[PDB]
Amino acid sequence: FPRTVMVNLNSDYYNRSTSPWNLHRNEDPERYPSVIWEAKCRHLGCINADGNVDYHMNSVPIQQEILVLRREPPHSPNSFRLEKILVSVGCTCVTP
Amino acid sequence: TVMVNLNIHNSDYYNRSTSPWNLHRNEDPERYPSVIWEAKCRHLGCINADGNVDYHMNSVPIQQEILVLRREPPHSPNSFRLEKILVSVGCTCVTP
Numbered sequence: 119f120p121r122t123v124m125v126n127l128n129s130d131y132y133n134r135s136t137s138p139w140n141l142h143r144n145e146d147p148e149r150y151p152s153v154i155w156e157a158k159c160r161h162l163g164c165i166n167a168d169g170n171v172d173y174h175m176n177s178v179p180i181q182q183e184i185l186v187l188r189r190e191p192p193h194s195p196n197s198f199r200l201e202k203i204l205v206s207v208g209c210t211c212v213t214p
Numbered sequence: 215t216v217m218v219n220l221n222i223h224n225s226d227y228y229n230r231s232t233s234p235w236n237l238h239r240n241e242d243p244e245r246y247p248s249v250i251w252e253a254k255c256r257h258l259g260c261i262n263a264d265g266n267v268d269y270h271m272n273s274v275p276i277q278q279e280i281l282v283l284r285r286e287p288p289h290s291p292n293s294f295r296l297e298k299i300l301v302s303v304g305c306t307c308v309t310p
């Protein structure tokens with residue numbers, strides 16, 4: 119039972135963080151936006167003043183739920199359904 | 215113009231982080247989602263082992279660009295414009 123609306127479509131913190139992360143290309147041709155950049159923490163611990171991984175702290179991913187569009191029917195260029203996905207944005211350092 | 219079906223299909227880090235943050239509502243009745251929870255860093259510095267703020271490190275917000283729908287024309291229940299907006303998700307600790 120669809121609820122159809124019309125839609126018109128028209129910093130190196132990752133390296134300097136004490137919980138640094140890498141950026142993964144999440145690419146899905148069935149989704150708009152097709153490309154989402156997601157974070158993966160580099161280490162389990164956090165970097166200390168000497169540049170070493172200190173495992174008494176935890177690098178953890180900062181996540182959120184966001185809105186994307188999913189092609190429906192599949193491969194449709196002009197019709198979609200709303201979709202909620204969980205994504206990792208960056209990482210932070212937490213006390214255990 | 216595309217067709218969208220509105221029928222959607224599918225960790226207290228903010229407190230324990232060395233760059234802790236606060237969460238506040240970003241609300242807009244003209245937008246889907248109408249409510250977006252955004253982060254503000256609690257301090258300029260980062261919390262050290264003893265629990266004090268160390269200004270030799272900076273708390274910085276981790277931001278990303280996300281998809282929202284804005285009613286077009288205003289107040290329309292079934293007509294939208296795709297928008298890209300910058301949001302603050304959480305905070306991390308970076309070295310100068």
Ligand SMILES: C[C@H](NC(=O)[C@H](CCc1ccccc1)NC(=O)c1cc(Cl)c(Cl)[nH]1)c1cn2cccnc2n1
Nearest residue numbers: 141151153154155156205206207278279280281297298
């Ligand atoms: C800032 C920019 N963002 C992006 O292009 C996308 C933009 C998504 C978008 C497209 C069209 C309309 C509305 C929104 N947003 C995301 O990728 C995203 C959001 C969250 Cl939330 C997480 Cl997680 N990822 C970017 C480029 N980048 C290149 C390399 C590494 N990172 C990079 N980010």
Ligand SMILES: C[C@H](NC(=O)[C@H](CCc1ccccc1)NC(=O)c1cc(Cl)c(Cl)[nH]1)c1cn2cccnc2n1
Nearest residue numbers: 182183184185201202237247250251252280301302303
């Ligand atoms: C995890 C949850 N998220 C959320 O309900 C929303 C969900 C957004 C959404 C709605 C409908 C369809 C698809 C997506 N997403 C966001 O709020 C959001 C995304 C980014 Cl990116 C930043 Cl920034 N904010 C939540 C509740 N919360 C209550 C208090 C404090 N934090 C909270 N988070």
